[PDB]
């Protein structure tokens, strides 16, 4: 949650099959926001976790607030 | 029926513990030495074995136990001071001392230890490891201490 405030990054678990570009289009279309970069690790427990850094113009704190995170 | 002693109107205070994590052999001896002692004398005596002033006579399981000067009087040259057992026997006696005095309203002097049954109990079985691919055991020997304070012998 500190990352949302200083890295503009919302961390989301996404499907393992999803590629970086697919999560860019999905985050943009579902949360109506602009994304800059998605870094992705597969959790030791086999879950893809995405670190979406939102584009500078949008602030993640507002985007997180709309989701409730 | 866990308690071996049958009071049959003997006005006694009884406290026990089940599978106490001590050695059966060492605890048995502490209880036997305590038998017949005044409740106060027993408390002082058990404090003395902890302080090494007085020894616990080993009347039964004595092989490999060293003769000491303190046991000269008890009639057995052999004796040992078992510290872990002494703590348990004092704790069990304390619960009996309080329970008789609260239940039978008896002054501490009147109460004297009268019964000491200790029964070997089931114990943990940690494995030991030996030479030539052999696996041994380090089975424990817990005991069920039952100590009863009473009016008179």
């Amino acid at each position: 949650t500190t990352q949302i405030e200083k890295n503009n990054t919302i961390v989301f678990i996404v499907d393992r099959r999803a590629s970086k570009p697919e999560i860019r289009k999905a985050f943009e279309t579902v949360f109506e926001t602009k994304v800059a970069r998605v870094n992705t690790l597969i959790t030791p427990l086999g879950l893809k976790k995405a670190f979406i850094r939102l584009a500078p113009d949008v602030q993640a704190m507002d985007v997180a607030s709309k989701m409730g995170l | 029926v866990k308690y071996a002693f049958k009071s049959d109107n003997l006005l006694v205070g009884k406290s026990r513990r089940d599978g106490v994590k001590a050695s059966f052999k060492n605890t048995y001896s502490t209880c036997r030495a305590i038998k017949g002692m005044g409740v106060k004398r027993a408390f002082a005596y058990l404090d003395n074995v902890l302080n090494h002033k007085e020894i616990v006579p080993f009347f039964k399981f004595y092989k490999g136990v060293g003769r000491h000067s303190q046991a000269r009087g008890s009639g057995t040259d052999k004796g040992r001071w078992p510290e872990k057992s002494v703590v348990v026997v004092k704790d069990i006696l304390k619960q009996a001392v309080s329970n008789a005095k609260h239940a039978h309203k008896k002054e501490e002097d009147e109460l004297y230890v009268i019964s000491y049954c200790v029964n070997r109990a089931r114990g943990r079985r940690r494995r030991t490891f030996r030479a030539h691919g052999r696996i041994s055991k380090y089975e424990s020997q817990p005991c069920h201490v039952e100590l009863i304070v009473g009016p008179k012998p």
């Binding site: 597969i42 959790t43 030791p44 427990l45 086999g46 | -």
Partner: protein, 50 residues
């Protein structure tokens, strides 16, 4: 091992999430009487994939 394979990682991952105790509420609902999983493993003794 730090150079693992996703397919191997996926099978090892299931084992980590599966090695869990019976939920206490499950024990209560079914009246289990046997609260130990017996399919629970330990990294020191158990060799998965052996």
């Amino acid at each position: 091992t730090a150079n693992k394979t996703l397919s191997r990682k996926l099978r090892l991952a299931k084992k980590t999430k599966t090695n869990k105790n019976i939920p206490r509420w499950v024990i209560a609902k079914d009246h289990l009487k046997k609260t130990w999983n017996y399919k629970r493993h330990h990294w020191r003794r158990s060799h998965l994939k052996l």
